[PDB]
Design an enzyme around this catalytic site. Structure first.
Site, PDB file in Angstrom:
ATOM      1  N   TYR B  69       3.455  -0.131   2.873  1.00 11.82           N
ATOM      2  CA  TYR B  69       4.882  -0.405   2.775  1.00 11.82           C
ATOM      3  C   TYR B  69       5.514   0.135   1.494  1.00 11.82           C
ATOM      4  CZ  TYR B  69       5.067  -3.310   7.001  1.00 11.82           C
ATOM      5  OH  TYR B  69       5.052  -3.773   8.307  1.00 11.82           O
ATOM      6  N   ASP B 154      13.024  -8.254   2.943  1.00 10.72           N
ATOM      7  CA  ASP B 154      12.063  -7.277   3.444  1.00 10.72           C
ATOM      8  C   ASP B 154      12.342  -5.866   2.885  1.00 10.72           C
ATOM      9  OD1 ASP B 154      11.457  -8.370   6.913  1.00 10.72           O
ATOM     10  OD2 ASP B 154      10.835  -9.279   5.011  1.00 10.72           O
ATOM     11  N   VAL B 155      11.274  -5.083   2.753  1.00 15.21           N
ATOM     12  CA  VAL B 155      11.371  -3.729   2.213  1.00 15.21           C
ATOM     13  C   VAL B 155      11.637  -2.614   3.242  1.00 15.21           C
ATOM     14  CG1 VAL B 155       8.906  -3.066   2.262  1.00 15.21           C
ATOM     15  CG2 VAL B 155      10.426  -2.222   0.424  1.00 15.21           C
ATOM     16  N   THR B 188      12.653 -18.994  18.749  1.00 15.93           N
ATOM     17  CA  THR B 188      11.199 -18.950  18.576  1.00 15.93           C
ATOM     18  C   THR B 188      10.711 -19.771  17.375  1.00 15.93           C
ATOM     19  OG1 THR B 188      11.318 -16.874  17.336  1.00 15.93           O
ATOM     20  CG2 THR B 188      11.116 -16.713  19.703  1.00 15.93           C
ATOM     21  N   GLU B 246       8.488 -17.290   8.250  1.00 11.67           N
ATOM     22  CA  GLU B 246       9.792 -17.456   8.916  1.00 11.67           C
ATOM     23  C   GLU B 246       9.889 -18.779   9.641  1.00 11.67           C
ATOM     24  OE1 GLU B 246      12.170 -14.171  10.832  1.00 11.67           O
ATOM     25  OE2 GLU B 246      11.194 -15.002  12.615  1.00 11.67           O
ATOM     26  N   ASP B 269      19.140  -4.493  13.480  1.00 12.49           N
ATOM     27  CA  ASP B 269      18.270  -3.407  13.972  1.00 12.49           C
ATOM     28  C   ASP B 269      19.055  -2.642  15.031  1.00 12.49           C
ATOM     29  OD1 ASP B 269      16.458  -1.707  15.243  1.00 12.49           O
ATOM     30  OD2 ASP B 269      14.765  -3.020  14.808  1.00 12.49           O
TER      31      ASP B 269
HETATM   32  O1  LIG Z   1       1.357  -4.569   4.931  1.00 14.75           O
HETATM   33  C1  LIG Z   1       2.431  -5.162   4.606  1.00 14.75           C
HETATM   34  C2  LIG Z   1       3.025  -6.095   5.447  1.00 14.75           C
HETATM   35  C3  LIG Z   1       4.206  -6.738   5.046  1.00 14.75           C
HETATM   36  N1  LIG Z   1       4.772  -6.430   3.853  1.00 14.75           N
HETATM   37  C4  LIG Z   1       5.985  -7.068   3.335  1.00 14.75           C
HETATM   38  O2  LIG Z   1       6.313  -8.197   4.164  1.00 14.75           O
HETATM   39  C5  LIG Z   1       7.567  -7.958   4.816  1.00 14.75           C
HETATM   40  C6  LIG Z   1       7.590  -8.612   6.198  1.00 14.75           C
HETATM   41  O3  LIG Z   1       6.770  -7.859   7.080  1.00 14.75           O
HETATM   42  P1  LIG Z   1       7.407  -6.946   8.243  1.00 14.75           P
HETATM   43  O4  LIG Z   1       8.622  -6.275   7.638  1.00 14.75           O
HETATM   44  O5  LIG Z   1       6.250  -6.140   8.746  1.00 14.75           O
HETATM   45  O6  LIG Z   1       7.767  -8.037   9.384  1.00 14.75           O
HETATM   46  P2  LIG Z   1       8.960  -8.019  10.444  1.00 14.75           P
HETATM   47  O7  LIG Z   1      10.134  -7.217   9.951  1.00 14.75           O
HETATM   48  O8  LIG Z   1       8.315  -7.505  11.718  1.00 14.75           O
HETATM   49  O9  LIG Z   1       9.285  -9.507  10.419  1.00 14.75           O
HETATM   50  C7  LIG Z   1       7.706  -6.442   4.775  1.00 14.75           C
HETATM   51  O10 LIG Z   1       9.071  -6.011   4.842  1.00 14.75           O
HETATM   52  C8  LIG Z   1       7.174  -6.123   3.419  1.00 14.75           C
HETATM   53  O11 LIG Z   1       8.195  -6.463   2.486  1.00 14.75           O
HETATM   54  C9  LIG Z   1       4.148  -5.487   3.034  1.00 14.75           C
HETATM   55  O12 LIG Z   1       4.665  -5.220   1.940  1.00 14.75           O
HETATM   56  N2  LIG Z   1       3.016  -4.879   3.427  1.00 14.75           N
HETATM   57 MN   LIG Z   2      10.792  -6.288   8.186  1.00  9.27          MN
END
Ligand SMILES: O=c1ccn([C@@H]2O[C@H](COP(=O)(O)OP(=O)(O)O)[C@@H](O)[C@H]2O)c(=O)[nH]1
Ligand SMILES: [Mn+2]
Ligand SMILES: CCCCCCCCO[C@@H]1O[C@H](CO)[C@H](O)C[C@H]1O[C@@H]1O[C@@H](C)[C@@H](O)[C@@H](O)[C@@H]1O
Ligand SMILES: CCCCCCCCO[C@@H]1O[C@H](CO)[C@H](O)C[C@H]1O[C@@H]1O[C@@H](C)[C@@H](O)[C@@H](O)[C@@H]1O
Ligand SMILES: O=c1ccn([C@@H]2O[C@H](COP(=O)(O)OP(=O)(O)O)[C@@H](O)[C@H]2O)c(=O)[nH]1
Ligand SMILES: [Mn+2]
Lengths: 288, 288
Positions: B69, B154-155, B188, B246, B269
């Site tokens: 990430y 989130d990143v 959910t 979450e 999204d």
């Molecule tokens: O291998 C990983 C998995 C998750 N994240 C961090 O945890 C957040 C939440 O995970 P993700 O965005 O995959 O989940 P979703 O958007 O599907 O909820 C990511 O945005 C990252 O900021 C990360 O840095 N590395």
């Molecule tokens: Mn995310």
């Protein structure tokens, strides 16, 4: 208490708020600085009562009854007992020049009344104005030690419906029932630049009432101190604002935005203005 | 600063809010506990920018970039520079297992970035979950001393439009873009009573995102501590909530109501959900 650690709410069963269904489509329910405007249909009182009871909230209510206005106290207080902050801790502060004329009103549990003697002023304008000084003097004194919020109202009024913790916030004003539909140029703000209350024709959000404002003790102390200081400047300059402490309150709330605004449900005159469709409740009303 | 003496706003010329004209009639703009729901058209950013600049507000933004990430950081940070709290003081905190992979991004004046090294976890669920622990550990540490508010996101995202001080409040969550129109039974939430995140089918206000929450440092410390503690209990009991941190965030915000709620403008999204009429702006969006 205010701002103290907040315990979890218990489980509650209530209707789901639906994002694609507004509570009210006929009225503005939030100001442009993101303060709620409090109308019937915008709040679930069960949620709010929980939140504020979990903080053991104490509300102080100030009312001035000077000279002939002591006649208004019985109905004011008896209806407050039926409608104002029921279930919460309440401290009434009655400021009067006639302590013996304060009626003996039976209070619910958790509610108390203090009679504070003050001097009577000759002019009704001066009586109305000197409330700012007196409220700020009592903030320093007992209010900081005794209550969490202060609600400051006119006495020539009666409660007809619920007035509760939905109003409570750091700083609130109430939309004047004569002007809630008016454009700002029509507001009766002080318009002379020589007064500290001066508001130009291209400024202003709302026209707020002198007769119903409040907030945390700290914010009410700030407001009433500022308005008292501004009134003293005007006096020194030989000018008296058009609507007295209401003009100064309006200047203050223009420059210090309130964190909630109460709809005209919260101060109405049915004799002068009837009962418009947009008002689902008349909560606190002028006595004829 | 937060909660400090607030200086007067200067004179400003802007459109009068009209009480009998809502800003938005198509959406709920205030929750039943009187928290604003932040949509385009509900706020005058010039007023809010004034209010928050007069307090010299500093906003911290936390982001985790663990394992692969780190590839998302360049676009995240470069677009944050264009859109996030521009004009205000900002401190980015990038938590990563690869400090050398953090891109060298040019920042505007009054903005800084700190790289905080952390351990990498094997499971993406665990990586996502351990953010609560790490954020609470850094609150005690530098956050209380360095910023007034924390925004935790989130990143794998980019800013496309304004995200500013309109979001700032003691505690906020963001409406998940998949569920803002859903009834609560369809949310959910964690539904197993054996989990600390359990929410019954007849409870819930909204479905909030794990990916965009924040508030004052104190309230964010409270939230992240509570969620971390609840996750530790679940682990000890051999259960992992359906949507990890979450699910716990949702339980927390059910029992501790947020003081603002951000509309799905703030985390969308477009690939999955398009661009509905009710969204006037897409401010912060998932990267494909
Ligand atoms: O291998 C990983 C998995 C998750 N994240 C961090 O945890 C957040 C939440 O995970 P993700 O965005 O995959 O989940 P979703 O958007 O599907 O909820 C990511 O945005 C990252 O900021 C990360 O840095 N590395
Ligand atoms: Mn995310
Ligand atoms: C124009 C039609 C509007 C009528 C409302 C006028 O009310 C008066 O407004 C003044 C400011 O311009 C000031 O606040 C006094 C206010 O009059 C008081 O409040 C009214 C609602 C009535 O109760 C009235 O009897 C009372 O004197
Ligand atoms: C039913 C249709 C709604 C589609 C939204 C589903 O999004 C997912 O929601 C989960 C909770 O049920 C959880 O929060 C993950 C979330 O999926 C993430 O966020 C979405 C908005 C997308 O970006 C998706 O790619 C991402 O994995
Ligand atoms: O002789 C007076 C005049 C005024 N007041 C107090 O000052 C308030 C404001 O005055 P008033 O209600 O006459 O003004 P209006 O409602 O017309 O603004 C009254 O409600 C009382 O609380 C009073 O006690 N005695
Ligand atoms: Mn009156």
């Amino acid at each position: 208490a205010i701002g103290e650690f907040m315990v979890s709410l218990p489980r509650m069963v209530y209707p789901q708020p639906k994002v694609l269904t507004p509570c009210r489509k006929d009225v503005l329910v939030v100001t442009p600085w993101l303060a709620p405007i409090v109308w019937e249909g915008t709040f679930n009182i069960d949620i709010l009562n929980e939140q504020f009871r979990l903080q053991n909230t104490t509300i102080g209510l100030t009312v001035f009854a000077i000279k002939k206005y002591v006649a208004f106290l019985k109905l004011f207080l008896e209806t407050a007992e039926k409608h104002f902050m029921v279930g919460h801790r309440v401290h009434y502060y009655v400021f009067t020049d006639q302590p013996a004329a304060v009626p003996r009103v039976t209070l619910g549990t958790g509610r108390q009344l203090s009679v504070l003697e003050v001097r009577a002023y000759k002019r009704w304008q001066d009586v109305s104005m000197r409330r700012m000084e007196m409220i700020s003097d009592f903030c320093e004194r007992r209010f900081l030690s005794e209550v969490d919020y202060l609600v400051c109202v006119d006495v020539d009024m009666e409660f007809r419906d619920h007035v509760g913790v939905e109003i409570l916030t750091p700083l609130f004003g109430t939309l004047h029932p004569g002007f809630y539909g008016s454009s700002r140029e029509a507001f009766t703000y002080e318009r002379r630049p020589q007064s500290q209350a001066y508001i130009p024709k291209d400024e202003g959000d709302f026209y707020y009432l002198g007769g119903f404002f409040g907030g945390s003790v700290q914010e009410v102390q700030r407001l009433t101190r500022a308005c008292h200081q501004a009134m003293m400047v005007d006096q020194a300059n030989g000018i008296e604002a058009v609507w007295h402490d209401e003009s100064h309150l309006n200047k203050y709330l223009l420059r210090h935005k309130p964190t909630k605004v109460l709809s005209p449900e919260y101060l109405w005159d049915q004799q002068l203005l009837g009962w418009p469709a947009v008002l689902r409740k008349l909560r606190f009303t002028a006595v004829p």
